[PDB]
Each structure stands twice: as structure tokens, then as C-alpha cells.
Amino acid sequence: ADWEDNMETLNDNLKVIEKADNAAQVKDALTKMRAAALDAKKATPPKLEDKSPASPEMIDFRVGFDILLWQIHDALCLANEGKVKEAQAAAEQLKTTVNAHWQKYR
Amino acid sequence: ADWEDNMETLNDNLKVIEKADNAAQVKDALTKMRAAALDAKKATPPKLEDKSPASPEMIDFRVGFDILLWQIHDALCLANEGKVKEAQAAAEQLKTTVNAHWQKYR
Amino acid sequence: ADWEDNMETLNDNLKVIEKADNAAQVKDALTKMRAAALDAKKATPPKLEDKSPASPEMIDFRVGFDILLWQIHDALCLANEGKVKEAQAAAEQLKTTVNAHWQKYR
Ligand SMILES: [Ca+2]
Ligand SMILES: [Ca+2]
Ligand SMILES: [Ca+2]
Ligand SMILES: [Ca+2]
Ligand code: NA
Ligand SMILES: [Zn+2]
Ligand SMILES: [Zn+2]
Numbered sequence: 001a002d003w004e005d006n007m008e009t010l011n012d013n014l015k016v017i018e019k020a021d022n023a024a025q026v027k028d029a030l031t032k033m034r035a036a037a038l039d040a041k042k043a044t045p046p047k048l049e050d051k052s053p054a055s056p057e058m059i060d061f062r063v064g065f066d067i068l069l070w071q072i073h074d075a076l077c078l079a080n081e082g083k084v085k086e087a088q089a090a091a092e093q094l095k096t097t098v099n100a101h102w103q104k105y106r
Numbered sequence: 107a108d109w110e111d112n113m114e115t116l117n118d119n120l121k122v123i124e125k126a127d128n129a130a131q132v133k134d135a136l137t138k139m140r141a142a143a144l145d146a147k148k149a150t151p152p153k154l155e156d157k158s159p160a161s162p163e164m165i166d167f168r169v170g171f172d173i174l175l176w177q178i179h180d181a182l183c184l185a186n187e188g189k190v191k192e193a194q195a196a197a198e199q200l201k202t203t204v205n206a207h208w209q210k211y212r
Numbered sequence: 213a214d215w216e217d218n219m220e221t222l223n224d225n226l227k228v229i230e231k232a233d234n235a236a237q238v239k240d241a242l243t244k245m246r247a248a249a250l251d252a253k254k255a256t257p258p259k260l261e262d263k264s265p266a267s268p269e270m271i272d273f274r275v276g277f278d279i280l281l282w283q284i285h286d287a288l289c290l291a292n293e294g295k296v297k298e299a300q301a302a303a304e305q306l307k308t309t310v311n312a313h314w315q316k317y318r
Contacts, residue, residue, distance in 0.1 A: 042162070042169040053158060053165070053266070063253045063254050148271065158266070
């Protein structure tokens, strides 16, 4: 449900970044990604729906989103200094982390 | 500090930022806000005292402080580059989020 | 990695930062510290091995690594601006936090 919609939002803004030209477009898209990742962090993903809220699996899930958030931050920092090409290359690796998380927990 | 005291710290420093003259005052206030938001993640609002510490409700509460922390980060990054007016405008957005969290959990 | 090996990594990279000659070296060390701290967030330290993963003590432990992560970020923000000496001074606060965490949780 809502976790899946957050995953899709992350992918949409990744495509937005991959087809961007100036630094402010990349920044806007990464900011939307950060918001979607934070919204997903509080969800219970489909694979873990049968586990206790107190399970170590859910803590690992949430810390994985913290890792994604610091990767988003690095891309955003590159974009905020006008390094558009480097920001887009960092976002290419974000595609991996985002969709690996998607595929791990769906 | 308990949750209400940490929220008071957030609001006191939002006022300091609103009335600030230079970048050093804004940076000091935002650093205090960051410390308060992190400390608040260890607290429990009175209406959630009967919930499990990792219940979805308490996860939502802690991740709401993560959302605040990333908005604080944006404002502090602006203040660190001497962008005082942009940092104050971002702190005005911070007040909205702080108020919404206050209303949600008090 | 387990908690102790992550603490080893944090201490090793604090030494690297202290002796570092340029911004690339400081950025690399701080990035490794960030990774070790995020990994340690999924661990259980020796003092809390008799506590539940979702106990209040373990939530407080994870928030302590969030605090460290934001201090790492401050030093990394300085290094990203080429302010090597200021970043090393900031890493003095990391040493205090890391040492206190070692003493509290070993
Ligand atoms: Ca009060
Ligand atoms: Ca209640
Ligand atoms: Ca060892
Ligand atoms: Ca060693
Ligand atoms: Na070593
Ligand atoms: Zn947690
Ligand atoms: Zn930053």
C-alpha cells in the first residue's frame, strides 16, 4: 500500500533526476525523494507484515532507510554546489539502493 | 528532557531564529533545535505511554523527529553558508512541522 | 560487523583525521565513520545483550548513534568546503562522543 507508493515516488524522482539539466531541478527531485523515504521508514513492508513490531527485522528495515537517506544527502550536497553531472551519477547508484530495498521487502 | 520540554526548546529557538541579526545566532539556535529533536526521539508523549516502545505509533513519533531533523539540516546548511534569510524562511517551514507534530501527539 | 569492530573503525578513522593532510583524506575517513555508525545502529552492544532489541535502552542506544551521525555530518560539511583544520577541530567532538559511547556500552 503506502510503502509501495513511496517506492514508486522514489523511482519517479530518480527518472526526473536522470533527465535533468540544472542543479535546482535535481535538488527539488532529491528533496521529494527524501520525503518519500522518510514516509516509507515508518511503514511495515509487505514481507514483514507477519513479524512483531519489536522484531530485529523491522529495526534492520528502518536503519536501511537511514542508509538511503544519507546517500540522498550526498547527492543533494553535490547538487547544492552546482555539480549536476556528479549528482546525476550519484543518483544512478541511488537507483540501485532504492530498488534493492523495494525488491528486498515487497 | 521529556517530550514537552524538548518541544518548548524547539519553539524558543524558532523565535530566536525569527528575531536573529546574523548567521552565528541562527546557527546556534538551529544546533540547539537539532539536539532537542534527537533527545525527543528517546521520549514518550503521555498519550502513547500505554503503547509498545516499537509500536507503529511510537515509530511514527520517532520518524516525525527524523523529518524535523532533515528540515533542521536544510536550514543549518543555509545558515552555515551565510544564507541567513533563506535559513529564516526555512525555519518558518519548520514551525509548521513542529506545530503539526505537537497537535498530533499532545 | 559487530559493535566492537565498528567501534574499532570509528577510533581508527579518528586517528586518520587527526593526522590528515588534506580534505579528501578527511572526507574519506568521515565517510567510513558514517558507514560504521550506521552499521553499529543495527548491532547490540555488550552491555545491552540482556535487553530486547526494542527495549527503551536499545532505542536510546540507536538514538545515540543518530547523534554521532549528525556530529560526523558537521565535520563532513566542513571538509566538503575544504576547511581541513575546522573539520579536524570538529572531529575533536567526535572523539568525545565515541569515547563516551565506548565506556557506556562495552
Ligand atoms: Ca510546559
Ligand atoms: Ca493512548
Ligand atoms: Ca575486533
Ligand atoms: Ca583493530
Ligand atoms: Na584497526
Ligand atoms: Zn527505532
Ligand atoms: Zn549536509
